[PDB]
Write a protein that binds this ligand. Structure first.
Ligand SMILES: C[C@H](CCC(=O)NCCC[N+](C)(C)C[C@H](O)CS(=O)(=O)O)[C@H]1CC[C@H]2[C@@H]3[C@H](O)C[C@@H]4C[C@H](O)CC[C@]4(C)[C@H]3C[C@H](O)[C@]12C
Ligand SMILES: Nc1ncnc2c1ncn2[C@@H]1O[C@H](COP(=O)(O)OP(=O)(O)O)[C@@H](O)[C@H]1O
Ligand SMILES: [Mg+2]
Ligand SMILES: [Zn+2]
Ligand SMILES: [Zn+2]
Ligand SMILES: [Zn+2]
Ligand SMILES: [Zn+2]
Lengths: 662, 75, 142, 590, 142
């Protein structure tokens, strides 16, 4: 193929007229021609098959030579997505004279300048396409080991822990990494594949998932209502060299910060995202990478999504429980809003293997559509499509700066954009409903004795394949069926399901094996049944949700669920500290207080060696404060005047921390 | 209780090696990191010591970096 | 006492507003510095552009739009190959000249992980373990 | 700012601010120091002054702490605590300040002005921290005395290089030599900018100053030069590292059969390999410097730093190394300024080489193997602290002779210093004896060494040479000039220029007169290579012309005369002034 | 009560100036003394472990008998250890056996500082001074 041929529309239409000839619905290759948010899934899914026969060097941004006050730049005026086809900008500033701050930000963020002004890289370490190498030498990054808190370790072996054969042991450490970590982790994007998800089934699972997302509200908000949670964080590749995100959130006024957002509703901004290695305690030696997304993408994704991302994180008692605090009797409210009157409950939990790397591009587009269905009024259609293209060029298929070199990320959600946990929640609900649809269809049909359910399957098939437009009566009936027999609880991929046992045994609801099959043909991985649990009882709670086990205690007069952490992770967080100044102990009492708060429910655990961890932290806080007043009585000559550490070593404070009052 | 003492001492030892600026010699740092990771993920006592020895001989191998004569004198 | 309280609140307000004015002056002074640094980076990256072959392929394009993934592939003067072990080095750039992206490259430098230059004669199968691995080999277009 | 007491090494945060060097002090020690001397100003983390703006009372005996500030009795708050109380002065770590009874020595060190010999002998018999503190405050006093020199305003510009100056009356004029630098100032009613750094030399004729400037600005009448002072930095390392004998040689690898001439020094090489540090004392010209060269040869696997107090001493060490040691591992580090002529035959300024030669003040902060300090008598405890702070090593050798002339000590004027108090190492030499000792002159012929064995050296020399009949004496007086208090004897220079022909073998002789101004004068009239006696002591010459200028206390000291004469390899002509000194040696009469 | 409230405010401010100063001084002391506290902690733990191989390699490393590469664990793998003194040779070398890290190694090649191979016969107490002594023994694990 000609190396410069990017407009592949004619070949795509020839393929579609040779293979899928009698496919009833139309197919417009460039998805910018599409009608609504359900002809974008269709055409996008068709393209994600038709784009595995075209050369992989003719995707990504489309650069073009412009002139700024007589000097020639090369800037990106479009994109050629594998799924979304060709997308041209509408504001191409040919022959500009002066660059304001918005245009400067746009032309600094996008990798057209960076890839064009770099050396061609040929990296045999990976299999992902390697676009360029910015510097003259590839930078290798290591991860130094954690620092030891020896005082706490001697105090821990003083109280009798860490013996031979103990049921509490050090397992969570600070693993180190060699030079080749950062690029032998990015290599895991080889687990991604271009997967053509089913297209008459996605256009019904979208309806059911959207019904799951019907309570919340949102829309485009102005610049002056965006609430930044934290501001002293890095700002991607081309911007971290000069300051944190505070600099770009302070240098831009509200006028040219709304101008940017209204610029990415009619253009496309390709965006480099750096990949750094996280430095934190973990239970296994594989290096963990976090993708820092450049401020040019966060500063608009926050503005576009913040109203919905605050309405989800402020509604209590729903399926997406993000923002329900596990303290203050919040875990018991979660675990009672799961048991939403199902018949013979059994708790089920799954775990997607390689969730944030092997997620197919089509389901990321699905998540970014269902998360952008709320904008039915604030913005027009083409504005929504260019927001979708900007999300799929700044999150899904972007340029990853991985140790001094721009590679192309084939797909899978980056773990660092604005809508990460919520997009993963939508994807997770999509897989749950898809497993349910497969389990309900794939039953023998003549064995389904419950005559209402058999009629539901006979209508489900018709609404799936023999019906082109929505059927809101049936979608409502099926979503009521799911919330009656498959009550769910989601935290971005950590799920608990309260499925009726008789229906699963008959097959009218998704058991584990249906999830193994759905993850096989839609997620392209294999969720081996040794890492998805099933609890046949309810007086013991879910086995592991949010990496905090659940146990049933007697508080006051009544029984409540309490979440307790893995009682080795607390000791691992005590003995090892990622910064050497945290070794000193006496500075950090406001750290062992937090650890004791997190580890208090171990007091009521029937095992004793678990139960001793909380008393270890209490006695250690008391000894830390004793030696602190010793040093502040030697160093100065007078004790502290208003000393208020007499409650941190009493269990009444931590027990009040798990009570339903506040 | 000697098993969970080798795991921590390896963390201190790798901290010492890192502070001696051994990150430059990438061939040496790969072996030190591999020994550290296999020490921590070791459920058997003898194997932990047999890898701790290999890790420690990296520290002893640097003639003009540490002062073993002074450090051990406090025994 | 009314006068003193009013005066104290006046001084509090004035030193709050002068604090705000210091903050805004610092912000507008940092913005200009970032703008100057960004313009410097853009004009230096412009200066590095190989304006002959790049201009040739752009003027050879359909509408002047060439996909970014082929901008280096046809115009980059320098090629940094990164090789993880000797088995690949035998099959990708054996000799002093190799062919990649349908153009002939000549080796100019070979460095190791810790950036110590290794002559091409030391990369032998028996001498493979002694080398510090992956070898950044920098070559030039010919 | 917390730290350790300079009297008892307790944690504290007080600093007796009346001291020029501002040392830390524990609470009890600070009270005992401010109760006795006139030191009545204590600096805590903030200074102890009456924080009331309308007051100036600083003495810590009467200051009261109130609220979060300090006040006098007049501005005392209703609730106040007296600072100076119950044997202590209020400060941090008040409960853990262990007192000390050594406050008398600290009072005498920090109070005395370094003029009499009592202060110096107090500065060498005290503890280690007191040794360091005394040396540091002595250096600070020298710097402040240097600061009190006059200002040189020019009158007219004679030439592009020659200048006519006038010093401000009321402050003594500093002497003109290569060490003293000046900063120029151009006053045009504004813009008092440093116009350059200038070094001055007295002219050949007339009241003229030849200036060499870093800058090339043309001088005008209004420009004036002010002497620059160096801020003496504090030191931390001990004067002497603690000795630790070793059972066997460590950090060294001996080489069998190094040479034949080094045969008698093998046992001393092994002894230096044994001990942590060692001292070698010997009479002049007995191979002490060449012993260090053979020591370098005997352990070729040792990165050796030769360092010395002087400049031409380390240059002569470089020359001896080039004579014996293989050249391409030796370097000679010169400073960035390097206003004096160095020795340019090794790879200059190469710290990474194996055999590194340096002055004490120019040493780079480095690790090393066995380090040889040369001419310890020329160096004070500041120098030993510097060499022990910058060079961390596994073996230390200190070579030098107590009988030679010591460091100048310009502050000292009344009384004379005994040899054993020169510094810590000379005290070690004269207390327990040198670790290695070798006396037999391999330098000078028989008559000169016989005379020096009749001199200060009580007769012990057994030199292996015979009377070469190349030693000559004179007696005539000569005329004194007293240029900048550095006398010049023009008729003596004239007689030396007269001689100069009747024995042509002395046309390569080297001129010796301490008297730096006369040393510069000798470079013009007869043009012989010349060297002052202090920058001597480590080099030697085949023929030496020594000229005693004035019968003063300076150029009649027996140590200075001995170290001037004993550089004569084959011959020396000395023209003497004192009748007794001339008669005390046995050369030819002339 | 106005007076006592003002004094109480001043006392609380004094406490906030006590704590911040304390945990700044301790923080800077801990972070400025990390290169040596870590090593002293390491050797305290190494005494605490009380093993055999660790004590053997440390006690040999005090006497200059360091190894020149990582001690291997696989059978028939190579190790080059320097022996710097004949007293450090008499304790570890017995025949062709070499006791190190509480394991037996077979001596292959003993080379002095001049790199010329010297056989085990030449290592005699009388003949000990006649060698450039810092020997490198290349041995294999047995
Ligand atoms: C008010 C308080 C205690 C009052 C008291 O009860 N004194 C009685 C004495 C008690 N005994 C045991 C010594 C007798 C005194 C005692 C120690 C004083 C601090 C440090 O010095 C210096 C530090 C830096 C600055 O300078 C200002 C702030 C600091 C924190 C000081 C504040 C205040 O000034 C302190 C807390
Ligand atoms: N064993 C010897 N054989 C030959 N010459 C020697 C021997 N010992 C000393 N010398 C000579 O004596 C001189 C002494 O020099 P040096 O050590 O600089 O004296 P000083 O230490 O008094 O400055 C050397 O120049 C050397 O040539
Ligand atoms: Mg000498
Ligand atoms: Zn909108
Ligand atoms: Zn004082
Ligand atoms: Zn004291
Ligand atoms: Zn006052």
């Amino acid at each position: 193929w000609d190396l410069l041929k990017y407009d592949f529309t004619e070949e795509r239409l020839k393929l579609f007229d040779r293979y899928f000839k009698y496919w009833d619905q139309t197919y417009h290759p460039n998805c910018v021609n599409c009608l609504d948010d359900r002809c974008i899934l269709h055409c996008a899914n068709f393209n994600v098959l038709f784009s595995t026969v075209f050369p992989p060097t003719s995707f990504g941004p489309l650069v073009r030579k412009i002139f700024v006050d007589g000097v020639p730049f090369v800037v990106s005026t479009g994109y050629h997505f594998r799924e979304l086809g060709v997308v041209h900008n509408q504001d191409v500033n040919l022959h500009s004279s002066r660059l304001s701050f918005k245009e400067l930000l746009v032309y600094a963020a996008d990798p057209a300048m960076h890839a064009a002004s770099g050396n061609l890289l040929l990296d045999k370490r990976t299999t992902c396409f390697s676009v360029a190498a910015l510097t003259n030498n590839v930078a290798f990054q290591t991860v130094k080991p954690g620092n030891f808190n020896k005082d706490f370790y001697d105090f821990a072996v003083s109280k009798g822990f860490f013996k031979e054969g103990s049921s509490v042991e050090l397992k969570h450490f600070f693993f180190a990494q060699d030079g080749n970590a950062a690029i032998s982790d990015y290599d895991y994007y080889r687990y991604n594949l271009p997967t053509m998800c089913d297209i008459r089934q996605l256009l019904f699972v979208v309806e059911v998932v959207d019904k799951y997302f019907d309570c919340y509200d949102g829309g485009c908000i102005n610049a002056n209502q965006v609430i930044v949670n934290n501001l002293d964080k890095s700002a991607g590749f081309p911007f971290n060299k000069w300051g944190k995100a505070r600099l770009y959130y302070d240098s831009m006024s509200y006028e040219d910060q709304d101008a940017l957002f209204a610029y990415t509703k009619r253009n496309v901004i390709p965006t480099i995202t750096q990949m750094n290695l996280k430095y934190a305690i973990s239970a296994k030696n594989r290096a963990r990478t976090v993708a820092g997304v450049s401020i040019c993408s966060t500063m608009t994704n926050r503005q576009f999504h913040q109203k919905l991302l605050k309405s989800i994180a402020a509604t209590r008692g729903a399926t997406v429980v993000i923002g329900t605090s596990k303290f203050y009797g919040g875990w018991h409210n979660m675990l009672k809003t799961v048991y939403s009157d199902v018949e013979n409950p059994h708790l089920m939990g799954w775990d997607y293997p390689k969730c944030d790397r092997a997620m197919p591009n089509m389901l990321r587009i699905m998540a970014s559509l269902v998360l952008a269905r709320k904008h039915t009024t604030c913005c027009s259609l083409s504005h929504r499509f260019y927001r979708l293209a900007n999300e799929c060029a700044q999150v899904l298929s972007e340029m990853v700066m991985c140790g001094g070199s721009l590679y192309v990320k084939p797909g899978g959600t980056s773990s660092g954009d604005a809508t990460t946990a919520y997009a993963n929640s939508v994807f997770n609900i999509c897989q749950a409903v898809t497993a349910n649809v497969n389990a309900l269809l794939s039953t023998d049909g003549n064995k389904i004795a419950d005559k209402y359910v058999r009629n539901l399957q006979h209508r489900l098939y018709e609404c799936l394949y023999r019906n082109r437009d929505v059927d809101t009566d049936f979608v409502n009936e099926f979503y009521a069926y799911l919330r009656k027999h498959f009550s769910m609880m989601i935290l971005s991929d950590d799920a608990v399901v309260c499925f009726n046992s008789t229906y699963a045994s008959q097959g009218l609801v998704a058991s584990i094996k249906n999830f193994k099959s759905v993850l096989y043909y839609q997620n392209n991985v294999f969720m081996s049944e040794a890492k998805c649990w099933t609890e046949t009882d309810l007086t013991k709670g879910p086995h592991e949700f949010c990496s905090q086990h659940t146990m049933l205690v007697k508080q006051g007069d009544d029984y409540v669920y309490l979440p307790y952490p893995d009682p080795s992770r607390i000791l691992g967080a005590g003995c090892f500290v990622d910064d050497i100044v945290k070794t000193d102990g006496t500075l950090m009492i406001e750290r062992f207080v937090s650890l004791a708060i997190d580890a208090y429910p171990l007091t009521k655990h029937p095992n004793q060696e678990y139960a001793d961890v909380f008393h270890l932290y209490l006695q250690y806080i008391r000894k830390l404060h004793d030696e602190l007043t010793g040093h502040m009585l030697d160093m100065y000559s007078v004790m502290l005047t208003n000393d208020n550490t007499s409650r941190y070593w009493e269990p009444e404070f931590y027990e009040a921390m798990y009570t339903p009052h506040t | 209780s000697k098993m969970s003492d080798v795991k921590c001492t390896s963390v201190v030892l790798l901290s010492v090696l890192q502070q001696l600026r051994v990150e430059s010699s990438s061939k040496l740092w790969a072996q030190c990191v591999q020994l550290h990771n296999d020490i921590l993920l070791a459920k058997d006592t003898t194997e932990a010591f047999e890898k701790m020895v290999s890790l420690l001989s990296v520290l002893l191998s640097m003639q003009g970096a540490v002062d073993i004569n002074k450090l051990c004198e406090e025994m | 006492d009314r006068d003193a309280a009013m005066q104290r609140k006046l001084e509090k307000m004035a030193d709050q507003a002068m604090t705000q004015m210091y903050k805004q002056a610092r912000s507008e002074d940092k913005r200009a510095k970032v703008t100057s640094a960004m313009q410097t980076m853009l004009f230096t990256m412009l200066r590095k552009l190989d304006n002959d072959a790049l201009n040739n392929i752009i003027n050879n394009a359909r509408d002047g739009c060439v996909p970014l993934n082929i901008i280096p592939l046809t115009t980059a003067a320098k090629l940094m190959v990164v090789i993880p072990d000797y088995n690949t080095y035998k099959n990708t750039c054996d000799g002093t000249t190799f062919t990649y992206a349908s153009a002939l490259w000549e080796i100019q430098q070979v460095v190791d992980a810790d950036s110590k230059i290794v002559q091409l004669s030391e990369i032998s199968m028996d001498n493979s373990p002694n080398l510090a691995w992956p070898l950044i080999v920098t070559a030039l277009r010919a | 700012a917390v730290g350790a007491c300079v009297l008892c090494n307790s944690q504290t945060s007080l600093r007796c601010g009346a001291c020029i060097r501002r040392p830390f002090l524990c609470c009890k020690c600070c009270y005992d120091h401010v109760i006795s001397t006139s030191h009545k100003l204590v600096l805590s983390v903030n200074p102890y002054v009456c924080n009331a703006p309308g007051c100036d009372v600083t003495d810590v005996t009467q200051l009261y702490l109130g609220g979060m500030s300090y006040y006098c009795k007049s501005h005392k708050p209703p609730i106040s605590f007296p600072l100076c109380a119950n044997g202590q002065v209020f400060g941090l770590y008040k409960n853990t300040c262990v007192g000390s009874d050594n406050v008398t020595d600290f009072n005498a060190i920090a109070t005395c002005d370094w003029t009499n010999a009592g202060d110096y002998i107090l500065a060498n018999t005290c503890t280690e921290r007191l040794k360091l503190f005394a040396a540091e405050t002595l250096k600070a006093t020298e710097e402040t005395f240097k600061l009190s020199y006059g200002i040189a305003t020019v009158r007219e510009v004679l030439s592009d290089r020659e200048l006519h100056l006038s010093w401000e009356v009321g402050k003594p004029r500093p002497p003109l030599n290569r060490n003293y630098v000046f900063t120029g100032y151009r006053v045009t009613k504004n813009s008092k900018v440093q116009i350059g750094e200038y070094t001055f030399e007295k002219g050949d004729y007339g009241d003229a100053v030849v200036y060499r400037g870093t800058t090339t600005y043309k001088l005008n009448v209004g420009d004036y030069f002010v002497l620059t002072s160096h801020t003496v930095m504090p030191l931390s390392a001990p004067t002497l590292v603690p000795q630790e004998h070793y059972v066997r040689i460590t950090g060294l690898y001996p080489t069998l059969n190094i040479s034949d001439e080094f045969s008698s020094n093998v046992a001393n090489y092994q002894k230096v390999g044994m001990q942590k540090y060692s001292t070698l004392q010997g009479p002049p010209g007995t191979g002490k410097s060449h012993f260090a060269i053979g020591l370098a040869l005997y352990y070729p696997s040792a990165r050796i730093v030769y360092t010395a107090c002087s400049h031409a001493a380390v240059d002569a060490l470089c020359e001896k190394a080039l004579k014996y040691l293989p050249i391409d591992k030796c370097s000679r580090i010169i400073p960035a300024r390097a206003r004096v002529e160095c020795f340019d035959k090794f790879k200059v300024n190469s710290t990474l080489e194996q055999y590194v030669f340096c002055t004490v003040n120019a040493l780079p902060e480095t690790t090393a193997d066995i380090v040889v300090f040369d001419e310890i008598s020329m160096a004070t405890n500041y120098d030993l602290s510097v060499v022990n702070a910058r060079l961390r090593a596994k073996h230390y050798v200190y070579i030098g002779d107590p009988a030679q002339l010591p460091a100048p000590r310009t502050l000292l004027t009344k009384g004379t210093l005994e040899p054993e108090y020169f510094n810590s190492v000379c005290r070690l030499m004269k207390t327990i004896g040198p670790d290695m000792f070798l006396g037999t002159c391999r330098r000078c012929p028989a008559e000169i060494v016989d005379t020096v064995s009749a001199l200060v050296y009580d007769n012990k020399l057994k030199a292996h040479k015979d009377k070469s009949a190349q030693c000559f004496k004179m007696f005539y007086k000569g005329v004194i000039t007293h240029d900048v208090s550095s006398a010049i004897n023009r008729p003596q220079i004239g007689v030396v220029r007269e001689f100069l022909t009747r024995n042509p073998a002395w046309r390569k002789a080297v001129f010796i007169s301490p008297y730096n101004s006369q040393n510069a004068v000798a470079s013009k009239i007869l043009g012989l290579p010349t060297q002052t006696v202090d920058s001597s002591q480590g080099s030697e010459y085949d023929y030496v012309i020594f000229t005693q200028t004035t019968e003063t206390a300076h150029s009649c000291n027996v140590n200075r005369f001995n170290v001037a004469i004993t550089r004569a390899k084959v011959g020396i002509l000395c023209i003497m002034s004192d009748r007794d000194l001339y008669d005390k040696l046995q050369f030819t009469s002339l």
